[PDB]
Amino acid sequence: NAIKYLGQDYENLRARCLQNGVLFQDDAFPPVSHSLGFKELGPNSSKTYGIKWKRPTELLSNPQFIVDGATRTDICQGALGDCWLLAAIASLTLNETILHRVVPYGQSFQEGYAGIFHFQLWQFGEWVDVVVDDLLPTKDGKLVFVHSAQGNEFWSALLEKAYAKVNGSYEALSGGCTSEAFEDFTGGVTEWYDLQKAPSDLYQIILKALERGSLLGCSINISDIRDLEAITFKNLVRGHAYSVTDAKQVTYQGQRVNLIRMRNPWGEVEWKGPWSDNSYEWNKVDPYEREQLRVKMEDGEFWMSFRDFIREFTKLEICNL
């Protein structure tokens, strides 16, 4: 159904490992120092001290590939600057067709387990099947890189590992563009919008894009490297990729106001201005709209008015199907 990346056939390798009663060891990505990195995640980096590569079966008694669906809450960034990738994975979960292309069925830690997992990505104008063993970087029994809000869920950790494999190391994923990951999941071309010169119908473009299941992301541009990952006063993170997850209207002070929802791939650190989780604006909207849209939780997800969105964020990335 897809091209076998590096000649590695999932079905055949899984069958050979299951029948012989052995766990898969990926010869294309060894569980070593080079696979972590060379500088930021190099052997001399403090972030790598004490890292041990362990399979999820060694971490807890009941490891699961997917728990309560493969959703955006399953994407919580670790000790790596791969927000671009993670923002893309979070956006990917909002479209069932794209999610089920990238993450194949029948993968688990119970029946059919052989220490091997696979994902499908778009590479060189075609879908490719990438395999990985389940040895993941851990420190004191906890995942160092991406993890789920659900402690025993490992799909997102394994997808990020597949990306690290394709790119050579986990560090090769530090610093990038959301656009590339969007393209790796759809085979489309991402369009950039300058929010300082935003077209008059941008909200309508966003609404139609989200309804079709397109992948959307946003960020605040930086001029220098020292202001990278810097926090704004209203708690937004600069030079950091966010996933745009919804766009809905609410009745506020007798008028229908345009709102937009985004998610920080850290799974925490949210906007604290108007329309934020604990903001007073929600008290003035009717009970139903309040209960359907607002979720008071430190989950990385929040709402902003479209007026504030275009004043704060500087770039919007939309990848259509």
By annotation, the residues acting in catalysis are: 83, 240, 264
Number of alpha helices (DSSP H) and beta strands (DSSP E) in the chain:
10, 12
Q: How far apart are CA 216 and CA 178, in angstroms?
A: 9
Q: How far apart are CA 319 and CA 301, in angstroms?
A: 21
Shortest distance, CB of residue 16 to Ca ion, whole angstroms? 30
What are the angstrom distances between the C-alpha of 253 and each of 15, 104, 124, 311? 62, 47, 51, 22
Shortest distance, CB of residue 272 to Ca ion, whole angstroms? 11
| Interface residues toward Ca ion, by CB under 5 A | 67-68, 74, 277, 299, 301-302
Cβ contact 304:260 at 8 Å? yes
Q: Which is nearer to Ca ion, 150 or 320 (CB)?
A: 150
Q: Which is nearer to Ca ion, 36 or 67 (CB)?
A: 67
Shortest distance, CB of residue 277 to Ca ion, whole angstroms? 5
Shortest distance, CB of residue 152 to Ca ion, whole angstroms? 10
Q: Which is nearer to Ca ion, 182 or 302 (CB)?
A: 302
* 221: CB partners within 8 A, 6+ apart: 238, 239, 314, 315
Cβ contact 202:310 at 8 Å? yes
Give rounded-to-5 percent helix, strand, coil for the chain.
35, 25, 45
Q: Which is nearer to Ca ion, 155 or 193 (CB)?
A: 155
The DSSP letter of residue 66 is -
Cβ contact 245:206 at 8 Å? no
Shortest distance, CB of residue 260 to Ca ion, whole angstroms? 14
Q: Which is nearer to Ca ion, 76 or 132 (CB)?
A: 76
Tokens 């359907």 appear where?
A: 292
SS (H, E, C) 182-199: HHHHHCCCEEEEEHHHCC
Q: CB-side exposure of 249: number of CA atoms within 13 Å? A: 11
Closest residue to Ca ion, based on beta-carbon distance: 74
